[PDB]
Amino acid sequence: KNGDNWNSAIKQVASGRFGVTAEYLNQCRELEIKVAQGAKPGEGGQLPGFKVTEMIARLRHSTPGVMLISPPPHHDIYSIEDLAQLIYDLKQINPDAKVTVKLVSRSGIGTIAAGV
Amino acid sequence: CGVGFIAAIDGKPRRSVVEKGIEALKAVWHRGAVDADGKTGDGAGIHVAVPQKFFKDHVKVIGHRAPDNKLAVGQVFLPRISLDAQEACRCIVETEILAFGYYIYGWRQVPINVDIIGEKANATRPEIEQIIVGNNKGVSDEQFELDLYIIRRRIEKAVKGEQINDFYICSLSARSIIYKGMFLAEQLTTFYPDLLDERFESDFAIYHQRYSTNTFPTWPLAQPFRMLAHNGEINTVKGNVNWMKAHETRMEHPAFGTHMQDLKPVIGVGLSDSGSLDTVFEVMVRAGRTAPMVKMMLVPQALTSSQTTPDNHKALIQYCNSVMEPWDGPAALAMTDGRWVVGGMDRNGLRPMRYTITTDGLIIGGSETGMVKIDETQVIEKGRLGPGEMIAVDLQSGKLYRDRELKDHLATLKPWDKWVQNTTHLDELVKTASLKDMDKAELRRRQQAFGLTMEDMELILHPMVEDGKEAIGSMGDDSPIAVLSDKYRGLHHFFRQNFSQVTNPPIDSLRERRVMSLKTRLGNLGNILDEDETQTRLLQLESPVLTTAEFRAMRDYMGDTAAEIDATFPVDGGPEALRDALRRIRQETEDAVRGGATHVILTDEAMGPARAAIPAILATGAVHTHLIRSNLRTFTSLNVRTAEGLDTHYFAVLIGVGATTVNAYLAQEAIAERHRRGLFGSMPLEKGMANYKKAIDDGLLKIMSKMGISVISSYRGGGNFEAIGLSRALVAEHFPAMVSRISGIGLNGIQKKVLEQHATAYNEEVVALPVGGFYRFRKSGDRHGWEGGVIHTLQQAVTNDSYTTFKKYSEQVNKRPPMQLRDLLELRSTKAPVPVDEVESITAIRKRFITPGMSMGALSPEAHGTLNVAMNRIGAKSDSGEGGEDPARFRPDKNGDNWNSAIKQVASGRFGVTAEYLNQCRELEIKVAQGAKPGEGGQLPGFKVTEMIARLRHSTPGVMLISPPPHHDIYSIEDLAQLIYDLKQINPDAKVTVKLVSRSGIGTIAAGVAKANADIILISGNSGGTGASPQTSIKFAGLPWEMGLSEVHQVLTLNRLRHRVRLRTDGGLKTGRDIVIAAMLGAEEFGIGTASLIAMGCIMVRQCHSNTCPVGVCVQDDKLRQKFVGTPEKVVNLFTFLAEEVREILAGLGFRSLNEVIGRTDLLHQVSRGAEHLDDLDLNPRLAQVDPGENARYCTLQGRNEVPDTLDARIVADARPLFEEGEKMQLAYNARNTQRAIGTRLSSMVTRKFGMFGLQPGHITIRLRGTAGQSLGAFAVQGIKLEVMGDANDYVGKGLSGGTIVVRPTTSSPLETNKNTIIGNTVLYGATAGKLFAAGQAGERFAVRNSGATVVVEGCGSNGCEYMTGGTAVILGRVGDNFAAGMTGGMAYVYDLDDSLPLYINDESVIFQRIEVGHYESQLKHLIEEHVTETQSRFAAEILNDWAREVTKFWQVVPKEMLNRLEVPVHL
Ligand SMILES: Cc1cc2nc3c(=O)[nH]c(=O)nc-3n(C[C@H](O)[C@H](O)[C@H](O)COP(=O)(O)O)c2cc1C
Ligand code: F3S
């Protein structure tokens, strides 16, 4: 009511697919795809046991007080063709948003850049 | 437009100064007008020192040997068309230079670039050359400059003496040089490539960029002049040039020598006002005086009778005003000598000026602050200039003198207190002389001799001596003009007063009487180029009106030195008695003057049954003009008696023509007679005489302030009038420079009428005075325009739908004898008639009609609503008026009507003006004046302000409301272009229409307004009604609208601007023939006005100013409002009938539509009255037809005229998420001075979206870096917040309604907050609600007409909180002069450290005291807490720390009207 916009303008599609939902993908302007980040490029994001509250369980559709660790590989990205298919899917489900990949700087990234 | 000066304090030549000057020139394009092509401007110029090394190297390159003494350079514009004229001009210059024996080094042709100048300013481009002269005789510099000045005068004279036009010496000296032209101000440095060389170095630079009012340019009329650079306009130019012509005969000095006989015509011919000002300035400087002294003597400071000024400056000002008469008007001067550089203001403080000091000893002054860029880490003092202030720099000693220090250094030269002590003010003289009768028969005889009536006499005389004020009319005058009458009318009916509309504003009289002077000096004229206490040995009077007692005292004083002259002529003389009488009195007074008599007394006590009296106006004019033409007026002070003077207009016109004092003895005789019969009651004779004298003085002050003049010493002999209905020969022979565009009766008719009246008076034994019918109607005589029969016939025709009755009404209206100018005309055509059906549809001409607005405070809201309903039903456009409008009227009706308007007025009061109120409309209207009162403004009596109008106007109930005459934000055409910019910014779908009043010379203002991006002009005649106005204003002002309309159309077509602006006239239209004639003259839209009122109940009772109008139209009480009998069907039928008659007459003419006739004057002809024998009124110039060329005479483009975009656009694209979702936003930008009206378009958008108060405060915030332009936050609604870091220019916070503005120096400022200026003038003009927190000294006219806003400022200027009505203002520190004058509602809190407030404040309607109630203490505490939280000012925190000790230092200012109506008692 006070002109406060609490929504998030960029949404993420990570390797966990915790809160992804048909309604969650239309409240945005740009969607982002997560491959790896600068701290844990291989093992994916993790969340401790005593952190997840009941609200976290409702957000992530899970059991309260359990250790949640995201699977390292995107189970639907096993090759670059899978990446193209996933971008097709995302652009189909959202008719007006943009897609974005997220890489980590390493040698031999040129071919990956050209592919994406 | 703008002037500016950059000076170095040390006094060393350098390049950075010229660099800064050119940079300042390059950023002023926003103020000056724009063109269509972008290659022509109004004129620009720079004035710098002479680069000695540059020309020395040039001469060395030529081949000569450069000497060591200085080298003078002179710039000349030679004619370019021919070739042999250039040769003769060079020969003239060389033969007048080589006379003094100097040596010439040669000429030079400055290279210029001729692709920048547009084609218009190129057809009159002169050939620019320079001449280099050198001193081989070896004289000092002062003699050198004096000789060069004398050489320039001699050259100008010898060239003028040969009719060699277009030859101008711009500047010839060895210290200064001038580079001026007609190019754009920006391209200066790319037009004169000489200025690009880095070898030009100076220590002072003065730049000017003017603002023209004519499409045809002229090079020599482009500022700056030799010793001056003026911004504004000088009103008193005619009186000043006349008195200069008088003084030209006895001014001499041993410095010049025989060459003084060359400089007799000190003022040339064909120069503008600033030109004459500059030439007199240069003379008085070269004579030996210094620059500050002559600045004081030409335009002095207002001699206040207060204890704010010590006696030193008081005696100085007395001497200055004793030497020379002032030059009133708005003027911000930036002049320079060879030694001093002075900036100064006028008496009132209208134009703006701001200066800044750097750390490296450099001072930069100009009109706006952001014109030059300086880092914040180098400013030392940002100042301003109040009324009459001045700041100077001395280059020889290298010092900077501010106001008080310079005033002291001036007043410490000569013993001014002793010199001023040799005067004599005639009060103790009459007091000690007081220690040392006419029968009623001859009294009535003479009263009938001079045509005085009885009822019209007491109706205007008894209210003068009863309370001390003047009468009040209630409706527009339709009496015949001075020449079309058949009864006797004195000469004063033939002179209409003047006024200023746009070029310069009028002056208020009730709240600015401190700055007006009515002093009169006798025996004071002398050598202005001499300085000795002999000049302060004269006679002083407080007012030029004298009763018989003081007149006898002065007569006994003068005694034998007077020379009394007759003013009578034999009645039995031949057909040429008046001319011989004039010649006789002329020779008599001239011989008396040559006889050493220093006084002339015009008296006509020799009237009897055998000799008639000459109208004193004519005698005074003849004597004055003859004493001027015989080089003798400088000797004798003219003294005049009369037997007719009764009203203020008579005394005004009698003093304006040359007289010094007027004594009306017969009126005092009549007053004493009326007292001896016991009519006033218990009032003594002396009290009545005092009231009468006060009334005459106030009338004179009103007539002076009508046109922006504050000194009677400069109005005398000015000829600021217009004679309508007189021959050209007589008005050019026996009167000063005036204007009479149409001719009139000559000497024969005057004598005939005088003799006939005298025969009716004395030959027959008249026993009682007639009843008279001038003001009111009577059956005896004095025919009018509206009559009983006509009113009844109109009412019947409109109430019975009988078109035949309307035809009979029109026939009755047209058959009357000629009562107006157009009645002397007759339309004709040679084509064949056409069946009536082919004429365009009735609705097509019905849509060309409007109804001029009337304020809601004047007439009852029922009639206003009826007009609006009828107009919104028929399809035409109505007007809301001046008193705002009801908000709930913004919704349609269930029956198909709408109680809204289509045109909103933005007057000089700004009552209900709000960002919303300017949105529900189509055509904004900016009222400047009207026909019933040109220079008074709208007024509303006391008891007509009920609670409804109180909640509408945000005012106090039961108290009078008189709007200020001048627009506090329109002081010149520059501010008017600015205001039109703001108004077109706030509303995207409106066309801004200006209103005008007919007068002489309106063409210049017309062309200016056309160039100022206006859309619709509106010319009004003198026959417009009102709700309340003085009688002199109604009967003795304005001209018929035909003359003005013809003039404005011809001027707009001449400059090829007519196709860019429509035209519209109003005032006294009843029939169809007048509409067709108005269409023929050039009008396109017509307003009917009061006629509609008569079709609604008004039957010309003329009691609207008493709130008891019988039928119930102009009323504000319950009982009379219920007697309303109006109906919109009446107005519908009225407009239907008008369109029907127009259709019929246009069919009879031989055309088919209105587009075929607009702009044609070759269809009119003139028929005269041979039996009247009067000199045929030469209406020929009113039929002057100029060929339009290719653009049609009526043509106009579709839609409003475009306008450039400001920063607001960049916001509305980056804030679109706000207009689509409604969320908080914070934006940041850099703000230059060129950007104007930052943040108004967003205000309009949010007003359309959420309304006035739809968003909570601070819903969207904007930060601005640098220097904001003019009109910051104009009409910002609640929810917007603006915060600027730096300084604002002017007009900041205008029209604020709910918004929030914050100004503050940036965080790195080394300055002191409460010791510098941060904003401009007229801050918060007519705001309604919101807040304004600042840190610094404001400007003059701070928070005028404020009502509801809350403002907190640290120190302000003069006229603070003037005319306030509500809200709260918290001032910290020193306040200006004349503070809280005329305040009516609200409250003020001042912080005084020296208890100086009781000396500056105005005790008219405010009381100042100490704070006692804890409630107000807590309120002020909260306000200061909020202010210091917002801007983090250190002074506010320091106050809040020591609050328990500062609660006593505060003073409270409370209006005299809210003493009991307030909830909490302000006094315990
Ligand atoms: C009673 C009355 C009140 C008026 N009030 C205003 C006013 O408040 N502001 C204004 O600009 N003109 C005012 N006018 C002038 C009209 O707008 C219009 O110019 C004038 O009445 C037309 O002249 P007319 O009487 O011949 O029709 C008023 C006129 C009358 C008769
Ligand atoms: S004189 Fe005025 S008050 Fe009404 S009756 Fe006529 S309009």
Short mmCIF file of C-alpha atoms and ligand atoms in Angstrom, two decimals, chain B residues 474-475 1093 1097-1104 1109-1114, ligand 2:
data_model
loop_
_atom_site.label_atom_id
_atom_site.label_comp_id
_atom_site.label_asym_id
_atom_site.label_seq_id
_atom_site.Cartn_x
_atom_site.Cartn_y
_atom_site.Cartn_z
CA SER B 474 -20.77 49.71 -10.40
CA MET B 475 -21.04 49.32 -14.18
CA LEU B 1093 -26.88 39.67 -18.09
CA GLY B 1097 -32.78 40.02 -14.91
CA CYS B 1098 -30.26 42.84 -14.64
CA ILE B 1099 -31.97 46.09 -15.60
CA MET B 1100 -29.12 48.52 -14.88
CA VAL B 1101 -29.79 49.42 -11.26
CA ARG B 1102 -26.08 49.99 -10.48
CA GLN B 1103 -26.05 48.96 -6.83
CA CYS B 1104 -23.97 45.79 -7.15
CA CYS B 1109 -29.29 44.29 -6.19
CA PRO B 1110 -33.09 44.09 -6.57
CA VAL B 1111 -33.52 41.35 -9.16
CA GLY B 1112 -30.89 39.21 -7.42
CA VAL B 1113 -27.97 38.94 -9.83
CA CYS B 1114 -25.01 40.65 -8.14
S1 F3S C 2 -27.29 47.06 -12.05
FE1 F3S C 2 -26.22 45.19 -11.38
S2 F3S C 2 -26.91 44.40 -9.38
FE2 F3S C 2 -28.15 43.36 -10.99
S3 F3S C 2 -30.00 44.54 -11.40
FE3 F3S C 2 -28.50 45.29 -12.85
S4 F3S C 2 -26.92 43.62 -12.92
#
